[PDB]
Write an enzyme that holds these catalytic residues in place. Structure first.
Site, short mmCIF file in Angstrom:
data_model
loop_
_atom_site.label_atom_id
_atom_site.label_comp_id
_atom_site.label_asym_id
_atom_site.label_seq_id
_atom_site.Cartn_x
_atom_site.Cartn_y
_atom_site.Cartn_z
N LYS A 157 -13.26 -7.75 -11.82
CA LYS A 157 -12.14 -8.35 -12.55
C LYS A 157 -11.45 -9.44 -11.73
O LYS A 157 -10.88 -10.37 -12.31
CB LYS A 157 -11.14 -7.27 -12.95
CG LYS A 157 -10.21 -7.68 -14.06
CD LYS A 157 -8.80 -7.26 -13.77
CE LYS A 157 -7.91 -7.52 -14.95
NZ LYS A 157 -8.58 -7.10 -16.19
N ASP A 158 -11.49 -9.35 -10.40
CA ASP A 158 -10.98 -10.42 -9.54
C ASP A 158 -12.04 -11.48 -9.27
O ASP A 158 -11.69 -12.62 -8.98
CB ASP A 158 -10.48 -9.85 -8.22
CG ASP A 158 -9.14 -9.17 -8.35
OD1 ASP A 158 -8.71 -8.93 -9.49
OD2 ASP A 158 -8.52 -8.86 -7.31
N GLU B 85 5.12 -33.79 -0.84
CA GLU B 85 4.11 -33.26 -1.75
C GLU B 85 4.77 -32.53 -2.92
O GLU B 85 5.93 -32.10 -2.84
CB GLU B 85 3.15 -32.32 -1.03
CG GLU B 85 1.89 -32.99 -0.53
CD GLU B 85 1.06 -33.61 -1.64
OE1 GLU B 85 0.99 -33.04 -2.74
OE2 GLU B 85 0.46 -34.68 -1.40
N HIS C 4 0.80 -1.21 0.00
CA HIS C 4 0.00 0.00 0.00
C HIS C 4 0.84 1.26 0.00
O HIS C 4 0.38 2.29 -0.51
CB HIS C 4 -0.92 -0.01 1.21
CG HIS C 4 -1.80 1.19 1.33
ND1 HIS C 4 -2.71 1.54 0.36
CD2 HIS C 4 -1.92 2.11 2.31
CE1 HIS C 4 -3.34 2.64 0.73
NE2 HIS C 4 -2.88 3.01 1.91
N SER D 46 0.62 -0.78 -6.72
CA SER D 46 0.96 -1.90 -7.57
C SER D 46 1.83 -1.46 -8.73
O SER D 46 1.93 -0.27 -9.06
CB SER D 46 -0.30 -2.56 -8.12
OG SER D 46 -1.28 -2.73 -7.12
#
Ligand SMILES: CCCCCCCCCCCCCCCCCC(=O)OC[C@H](COP(=O)([O-])OCC(O)COP(=O)([O-])OC[C@@H](COC(=O)CCCCCCCCCCCCCCCCC)OC(=O)CCCCCCCCCCCCCCCCC)OC(=O)CCCCCCCCCCCCCCCCC
Ligand SMILES: CCCCCCCCCCCCCCCC(=O)OC[C@H](COP(=O)([O-])OCC[N+](C)(C)C)OC(=O)CCCCCCCCCCCCCCC
Ligand SMILES: CCCCCCCCCCCCCCCC(=O)OC[C@H](COP(=O)(O)OCCN)OC(=O)CCCCCCCCCCCCCCC
Ligand SMILES: CCCCCCCCCCCCCCCC(=O)OC[C@H](COP(=O)(O)OCCN)OC(=O)CCCCCCCCCCCCCCC
Ligand SMILES: CCCCCCCCCCCCCCCC(=O)OC[C@H](COP(=O)(O)OCCN)OC(=O)CCCCCCCCCCCCCCC
Ligand SMILES: CCCCCCCCCCCCCCCC(=O)OC[C@H](COP(=O)(O)OCCN)OC(=O)CCCCCCCCCCCCCCC
Ligand SMILES: CCCCCCCCCCCCCCCC(=O)OC[C@H](COP(=O)(O)OCCN)OC(=O)CCCCCCCCCCCCCCC
Ligand SMILES: CCCCCCCCCCCCCCCC(=O)OC[C@H](COP(=O)(O)OCCN)OC(=O)CCCCCCCCCCCCCCC
Ligand SMILES: CCCCCCCCCCCCCCCC(=O)OC[C@H](COP(=O)(O)OCCN)OC(=O)CCCCCCCCCCCCCCC
Ligand code: HEM
Ligand code: HEM
Ligand code: HEM
Lengths: 431, 385, 48, 62, 126, 57, 76, 110
Positions: free
Chosen positions: B228-229, B272, B202, B206
């Site tokens: 969009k997410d 895994e 923040h 971005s």
């Protein structure tokens, strides 16, 4: 270059300079405002201003004589300036008006007018001149309940209580022969001035000045005279410095010169080789600062004095300044000491050999009152050039690493933190 | 002002979700961070609802997981959701890390963001390991044995650290109960680290796929990147629903349905699948101390990448050689995982050592040289002299 | 069965924590002395 | 009453004000608190780690 | 992270040599054509990451017409890559249009910062 | 010699915290021994060593 | 005489750290290394491996740390 | 500005612990909140170090707590710390609520 000689009652010191075009003759006493009480404070200011009365200045101006007077904490001077062929008239005026016929300046309706003038003058200093009164309060809390805390201007409540008998009492206690140095700067010779002093019988008084009972002692404290209607925030901050005739006197001057003085509105002062300006030029932490090293007869003060309108980041300013002060103790480099050596020799040459024979008479009378002789500029330059990095580190370990501070501030200093948070910056945790 | 700005907590939700100015040009690769938050909420919720039925004793671990799979109503839903959501957590985490490696999101402002991300990567690897060992199957017991016997290579206090981790003399009841307490705890450290990730995100915003400054054209996150997410949230739920309801044991090793037997080696001890490249970087080095040091360096070599990326434009969007070597790094990672799944046999040892060297030469050798060469080519292609 | 060792560790812990409590009281009074002995004076300002 | 007339702190000022003496007195107390805090922090961390080490139930089956 | 003065030094050495020029300049021209930043309307000095004080200094010192034009090219590239298309072929930045316009300002601010650091760390010869 | 005392131990914070940890080590050993000896001496005759010596005699 | 130039070298530095500051800091770095080693000697005192290797070799505090229970009242 | 101010996380720590302006006249009843934070840290750490050994079946719950009291090294320290620290958690919390009730720290801004 300068000649001091003790004639049969009095010390005559000259600094002859034939390239000058005036010649300042005066008497410098060695009883400044450290020789007052809290209750007669400002009697030296009033002696200065009735030496500079209109009645006393008409007499000098009719003969072509200009009068200049100065009050400090150690000394006080009464200097009569004249053209070079007019030294006999300067000594005649200094003998008659100030020394012998002293009860004519001290008349009623001249003392009353001059007391009203210094009342208005001290009130105008106390309301308008904010950096110099913060320095005065820095002395007032650094050496409180001790003779050096008395402001040389004199307070407003102690100046109102003063009568003519207080000036006469201060005169009889201090304006003496064992306390005076009669100074000639400009272009009068030492032989000529001492012949004139032997010619007219020049004697002030015979007794000895009163010995102060307690020596000046630094006490770490603070005063917070916050005034939220002022634009800026003035803050002085100091540790105990070396007194005069200390072996670390020039070292304290050099360490004050390592961090120098700064003026953020001047573009050629931005480019100084201080490492503090990288810290304080990002958010413009201060408007100006100056690091000083005052030295008196008993003790001294070493620190800085700043002013900023960034009233929210006062703590970052004080923090970065004191974190730079710790570098003298831990990691002061060589080129900081060499730059400060060159700049300190430049500052001392601009201070001592300027073209004004009043200031030279002041400095000469003080330096031969305290030490008995005046140190030449060449020997001072050799003492400055002999200071190494180890000397600054030893002095900063003695006087600066984790020592008590005296703080003084006025204005919008809500952002200035309290004492222990600032005093915690005198010693890092070695990082 | 609005109540979403004036309140104490709604100003936080507003300044992170509702009014958070994203650049207009970011693509669906920027959805993986919100998808990782969704994976974490899925893991924590299904984990609590199975911890209400799981018993951590070494006699009741496998029996209690089978009690969840049989007796608990929709407990098979919770168990397959937890397991395949952990696999999907690591898929979306590799996509988040790879888009960070690609678009230069590790450079000068966001070094704190990249380093907190690496801390989250380490903690999530540790959580997945402890939770895999909580089932106490055959791969769980022997994976615990191998990876905690790795720490007996430290020459000073290796046996002390090993017998402190085990709680005894082999992997046993105190080891499995230790691992269950830690597997409950460490995801809340992951949630706090995600809040620190969001702080470091923040303070500088971005990045965008062009690498250029995004301050000029920006869009509030609500009503644009929320939906969009939401597209990728429903797509992630669709692929996870397929892998939970139709192929639930594809991403699991079939040896975990054997109960944990300390006296039988299952002839291929394999963790895994998302820890398999680090298992290969482990087994490449023929020394137990340097092997685990190289595995920890394989996780910690991403911290070198801000100071080795010598480029002056950010991100491999406009760089040909950097794009080619980035996908060489990606398929080297896939080769490293497939190598670590294999046995320790003759072409596989040399291929794993070569792939480990390419993995470490990407960050340390390839990236500075290729980015310097691209700086020189970008200069001389348009400077006329 | 931890009774003897528990009272032993209680003696150690009580001695260390009582000494730390008294030292912390002294350190509190020392750090707070500069604030605790403040003095405010008020000379009321001149009207404008 | 002037601002240059500092008030009576004489009841709280110590009569001798040697710097090294008072600083050694203050830092000896701060160092003693850090001393016993270091001992207590060591004992606390060793308590929790030694709780995590092993149990008597498996040390009998050693 | 790589200083622009170093890129200028190496590139000037390549361009001043007749063999290295004719060997590496077509490689760089095909590299720039494959890089594809011109298809979005960007010149290369829009691509330099500005989040450092040397680049902030150069962008402060840019004249205003170049600043407004650079702002339009950046916003246009953001909208173009938002729509997942390219600009049409007459809106591509031509080769003669791709001039280094920020580069003297970057190199001057870089020389000023390097001189400032060198004078911060001097040792006077005594 | 309070100046020497300050300049040695309290001027450098590294030497300060080093003396703190060295004193904490010596303190832990000596003080744990003193509490163990005082507890076992206060409870004389009631500990297992004394019961074992009574069984032995 | 008259000096027209200022003769100076450019020092040795890595941006922030200088060689002069490193040489001015290095003995206190050794002091902090010794202080952290004493801190590890504190916080590893109960560790019986470090007691066996290091702390029982101490003259006056060494045999103080070891116990005197015989192998007749130890269960294991 | 200072590094505790300009950092992301150290600015939080600074504005909540280091530079946080507290009034000069608050008394030792304002120490109860910091004591509750200390209580909660004690409870969480001791509870994790006992959940490493506790078995939550109905047949193993009481016997596993009895195993913590008997077999775990310093396990009685952890168990008594947890129980008495929960009791002291509620003692200090009742003092915190009663301080808010006395000094009116519930009112119009808070
Ligand atoms: C661990 C060391 C962490 C650290 O970075 O210390 C900085 C510190 C450097 O401080 P500095 O250089 O004096 O500060 C000047 C700066 O400009 C900074 O000046 P400032 O105004 O920002 O200073 C505020 C000051 C104020 O300190 C505090 O606020 C402490 C408050 C703690 C609340 C809980 O913070 C410190 O500098 C000292 C921090 C003390 C360590 C706290 C670690 C707690 C971990 C939990 O280095 C050390 O403290 C070394 C001491 C190491 C002691 C080891 C034993 C204790 C270990 C815990
Ligand atoms: C776990 C608890 C461990 C506490 C350890 C306390 C300790 O190691 O020492 C206390 C130091 C003293 O720090 P100080 O009182 O600010 O001293 C600064 C340096 N002088 C002024 C002497 C030059 O304090 C520090 O140096 C900071 C460490 C405190 C954490
Ligand atoms: C439930 C409905 C309660 C009343 C709603 C109302 O009445 O809404 C009134 C307020 C806004 O009021 P205002 O900002 O217009 O100004 C107030 C003065 N006229 O809505 C809100 O709380 C903000 C809604 C945003 C919620 C975001 C939640 C995200 C977290 C998940
Ligand atoms: C168990 C789960 C419980 C969850 C409950 C959480 C809501 C708090 C209740 C407040 C009660 C109250 O009294 O709220 C009333 C106050 C009044 O607001 P005011 O003082 O601005 O106006 C006063 C006028 N002068 O705020 C609210 O309107 C809160 C409404 C929105 C709630 C925010 C949603 C939660 C966001 C959390 C962000 C998380 C960050 C933390 C990171 C670790
Ligand atoms: C972050 C987690 C915080 C947890 C805080 C728990 C402590 C809160 C107070 C609880 C009662 C006192 C401690 C009992 C546990 C103990 O260890 O007491 C035993 C010790 C001595 O015993 P010993 O050395 O002989 O052996 C122990 C192993 N055989 O007594 C003490 O010296 C206690 C001194 C307290 C000082 C606290 C300093 C805080 C540092 C935090 C790290
Ligand atoms: C991670 C650290 C694991 C330490 C370990 O491997 O611990 C093993 C030892 C075991 O010796 P013991 O004293 O527990 O008891 C022996 C049987 N009564 O634990 C310790 O107490 C010593 C270490 C304490 C932790 C030090 C932390 C600071 C460094
Ligand atoms: C040992 C490390 C030494 C590093 C070197 C050094 O200490 O560096 C000193 C730096 C210098 O910072 P400056 O302001 O002088 O920056 C000037 C740049 N020109 O201070 C710092 O790092 C930050 C100090 C702040 C300390 C914060 C303490 C936090 C307490 C709480 C801990 C978390 C609790 C969470 C709940
Ligand atoms: C555990 C902590 C992990 C820290 C990762 C550091 C990665 C890195 O690399 O961080 C380097 C950066 C400095 O970088 P910078 O100042 O250049 O940039 C900064 C741009 N403004 O912060 C640090 O120094 C970290 C300091 C230590 C952590 C502080 C204390 C942690 C708790 C804080 C409170 C969190 C509240 C969360 C719950 C609400
Ligand atoms: C829920 C959350 C609540 C938020 C509020 C929490 C408030 C903290 C409450 C806990 C108190 C922590 C004390 C830290 C002391 C400190 O850090 O001491 C830092 C000071 C800074 O010295 P100076 O800068 O004055 O240096 C002046 C010259 N430079 O060095 C000291 O003197 C250390 C003295 C020894 C202190 C040991 C304390 C050990 C505490 C153990 C228990 C901790 C739990
Ligand atoms: C960080 C997020 C998490 C990850 C990555 C994770 C990972 C895993 C994995 C891979 C398994 C093994 C699944 C299998 O193969 O059967 C597992 C098991 C388990 N996890 Fe988690 N987990 C997470 C969060 C949690 C949390 C927070 C809890 C507790 C509340 C939890 C409780 C369990 C339990 C009880 C098991 C036991 C076996 C089972 O029922 O699947 N998990 N975890
Ligand atoms: C639980 C795990 C994680 C969560 C919830 C998470 C969350 C987020 C979110 C929501 C964003 C903003 C949206 C975006 O840019 O994609 C983000 C950005 C970022 N994350 Fe993560 N993250 C996680 C793990 C990681 C990891 C493992 C790394 C790599 C080391 C990482 C590095 C980054 C970087 C570099 C960015 C900035 C990307 C950019 O803006 O260009 N994160 N994270
Ligand atoms: C909010 C802080 C907490 C409070 C107030 C709290 C309260 C309690 C109380 C009153 C008991 C019963 C003590 C007894 O009579 O034996 C207890 C037991 C227990 N708590 Fe907590 N607790 C807290 C945090 C935790 C956490 C986070 C965990 C898990 C990691 C935990 C694990 C346990 C365990 C395992 C027991 C089992 C019985 C025992 O050995 O005491 N506690 N808790």
């Amino acid at each position: 270059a300068e000649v001091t000689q003790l004639s049969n009652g009095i010390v005559v010191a000259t600094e002859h300079n034939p390239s000058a075009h005036t010649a300042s003759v005066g008497v410098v006493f060695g009883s400044g405002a450290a020789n007052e009480n809290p209750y007669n404070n400002g009697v030296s200011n009033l002696w200065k201003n009735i030496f500079l009365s209109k009645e006393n200045s008409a007499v000098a101006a009719k003969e072509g004589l200009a009068l200049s007077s100065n009050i400090s904490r150690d000394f006080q001077s009464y200097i009569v300036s004249s053209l070079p062929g007019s030294t006999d008239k300067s000594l005649d005026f200094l003998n008659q008006s100030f020394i012998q016929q002293k009860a004519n300046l001290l008349s009623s309706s001249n003392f009353e007018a001059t007391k009203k003038s210094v009342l208005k003058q001290v009130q105008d200093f106390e309301e308008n001149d904010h950096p110099n009164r913060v320095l005065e309060h820095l002395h007032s809390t650094a050496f409180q309940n001790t003779p050096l805390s008395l402001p040389t201007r004199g307070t407003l409540e102690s100046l109102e209580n003063l009568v003519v008998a207080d000036l006469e009492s201060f005169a009889n206690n201090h304006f003496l022969n064992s306390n005076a140095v009669v100074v000639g700067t400009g272009n009068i010779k030492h032989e000529d001035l001492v012949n004139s002093i032997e010619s007219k019988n020049l004697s002030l008084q015979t007794g000895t000045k009163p010995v102060l009972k307690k020596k000046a002692a630094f006490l770490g404290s603070e005063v917070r005279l916050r005034d939220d209607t002022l634009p800026k925030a003035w803050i002085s901050l100091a540790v105990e410095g070396e007194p005069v005739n200390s072996p670390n006197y020039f070292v304290a001057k050099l360490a004050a010169q390592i961090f120098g003085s700064y003026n953020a509105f001047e573009p050629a002062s931005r480019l100084q080789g201080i490492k503090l300006l990288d810290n304080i030029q990002e958010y413009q932490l201060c408007d100006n600062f100056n690091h000083f090293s005052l030295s008196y007869k008993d003790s001294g003060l070493w620190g800085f004095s700043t002013a900023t309108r960034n009233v929210t980041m006062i703590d970052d300013l004080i923090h970065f300044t004191l974190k730079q002060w710790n570098r003298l103790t831990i990691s002061v480099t060589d080129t900081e000491v060499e730059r400060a050596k060159s700049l300190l020799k430049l500052q001392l040459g601009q201070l001592y050999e300027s073209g004004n024979p009043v200031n030279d008479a002041n400095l000469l009378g003080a330096e031969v009152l305290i030490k008995g002789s005046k140190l030449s500029l060449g020997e001072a330059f050799k003492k400055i050039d002999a200071i190494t990095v180890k000397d600054v580190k030893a002095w900063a370990g003695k006087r600066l690493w984790d020592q008590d501070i005296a703080i003084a501030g006025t204005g919008q200093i809500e952002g200035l933190l309290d004492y222990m948070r600032i005093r915690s910056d005198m010693s890092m945790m070695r990082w | 002002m609005a109540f979403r700005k004036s309140n104490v907590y709604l100003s936080l939700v507003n300044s992170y979700i509702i009014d958070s100015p994203q650049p207009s040009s970011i693509n669906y690769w920027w959805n993986m961070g919100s998808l990782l938050g969704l994976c974490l909420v899925i893991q924590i919720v299904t984990g609590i609802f199975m911890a209400m039925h799981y018993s951590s004793n070494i006699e009741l671990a496998f029996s209690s997981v089978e009690h969840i799979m049989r007796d608990v109503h929709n407990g098979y839903i919770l168990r397959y959701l937890h397991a395949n959501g952990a696999s999907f957590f690591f898929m979306v985490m590799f996509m988040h890390m790879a888009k960070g490696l690609y678009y230069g999101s590790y450079r000068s402002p966001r070094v704190t963001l990249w380093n907190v991300g690496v801390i989250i990567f380490i903690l999530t690897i540790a959580t997945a390991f402890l939770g895999y060992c909580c089932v106490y199957g055959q791969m769980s017991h022997w994976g615990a044995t191998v990876i905690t016997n790795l720490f007996s290579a430290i020459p000073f206090v290796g046996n002390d650290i090993v017998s402190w981790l085990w709680g005894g003399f082999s992997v046993s009841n105190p080891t499995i109960q230790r691992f269950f307490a830690l597997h409950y705890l460490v995801p809340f450290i992951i949630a706090a680290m995600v809040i620190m990730h969001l702080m470091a995100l923040h303070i500088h915003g971005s990045s965008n796929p062009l690498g250029i400054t995004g301050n000029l054209d920006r869009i509030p996150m609500h009503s644009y990147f929320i939906f969009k997410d939401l597209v990728t949230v429903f797509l992630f739920m669709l692929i996870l629903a397929l892998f939970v309801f139709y192929s639930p044991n594809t991403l699991g090793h079939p040896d975990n349905y054997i109960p944990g037997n300390p006296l039988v080696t299952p002839a291929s001890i394999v963790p895994e699948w998302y820890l398999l490249p680090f298992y290969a970087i482990l087994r490449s080095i023929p020394d137990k101390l340097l092997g685990v040091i190289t595995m920890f360096a394989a996780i910690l070599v991403l911290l070198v990448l801000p100071f080795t990326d010598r480029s002056v434009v950010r991100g491999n969007t406009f760089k040909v050689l950097s794009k080619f070597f980035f996908f060489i790094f990606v398929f080297n990672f896939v080769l490293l995982g497939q190598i670590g799944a294999c046995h320790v046999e003759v072409p596989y040892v040399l291929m794993g050592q070569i792939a480990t060297f390419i993995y470490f030469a990407y960050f340390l050798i390839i990236v500075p040289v290729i980015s310097t060469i691209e700086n020189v080519l970008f200069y001389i292609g348009r400077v006329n002299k | 069965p931890e009774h003897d060792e528990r009272k032993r560790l209680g003696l150690k812990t009580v001695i260390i924590l009582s000494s730390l409590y008294l030292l912390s009281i002294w350190v509190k009074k020392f750090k707070w002395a500069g604030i605790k002995t403040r003095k405010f004076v008020f000379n009321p300002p001149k009207p404008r | 009453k002037s601002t240059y007339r500092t008030p009576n702190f004489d009841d709280v000022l110590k009569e001798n004000n040697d710097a090294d003496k008072g600083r050694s007195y203050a830092y000896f107390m701060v160092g003693a608190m850090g001393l016993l805090s270091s001992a207590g922090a060591k004992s606390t961390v060793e308590t929790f780690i030694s709780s995590m080490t092993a149990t008597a139930d498996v040390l009998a089956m050693a | 992270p790589q200083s622009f003065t170093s890129i200028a030094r190496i590139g000037d050495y390549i361009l001043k040599s007749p063999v290295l020029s004719k060997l590496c300049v077509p490689v760089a021209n095909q590299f720039i054509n494959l890089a594809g930043y011109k298809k979005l309307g960007l010149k290369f000095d829009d691509l330099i990451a500005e989040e450092n004080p040397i680049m902030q200094t150069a962008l402060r010192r840019l004249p205003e017409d170049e600043s407004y034009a650079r702002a339009y090219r950046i916003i246009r590239a953001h909208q173009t890559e938002l729509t997942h298309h390219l600009l049409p072929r007459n809106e591509w930045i031509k080769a003669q249009e791709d001039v280094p316009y920020l580069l003297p300002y970057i190199l001057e601010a870089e020389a000023a910062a390097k001189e400032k650091d060198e004078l911060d760390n001097i040792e006077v010869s005594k | 010699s309070f100046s020497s005392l300050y300049k040695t131990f309290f001027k450098r914070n590294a030497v300060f915290v080093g003396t703190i940890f060295a004193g904490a080590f010596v303190f832990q050993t000596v003080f744990d021994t003193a509490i163990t000896s005082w507890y076992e001496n206060h409870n004389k005759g009631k500990l297992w060593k004394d019961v074992k010596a009574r069984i032995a005699a | 005489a008259y000096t027209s130039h200022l003769s100076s070298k450019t020092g040795l530095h890595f941006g922030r750290l200088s060689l002069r500051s490193l040489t001015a800091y290095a003995p206190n770095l050794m002091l902090w290394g010794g202080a952290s080693m004493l801190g590890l000697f504190v916080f590893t005192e109960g560790w019986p491996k470090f007691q066996d290797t290091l702390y029982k070799k101490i003259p006056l505090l060494g045999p103080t740390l070891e116990d005197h229970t015989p192998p007749e009242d130890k269960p294991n």
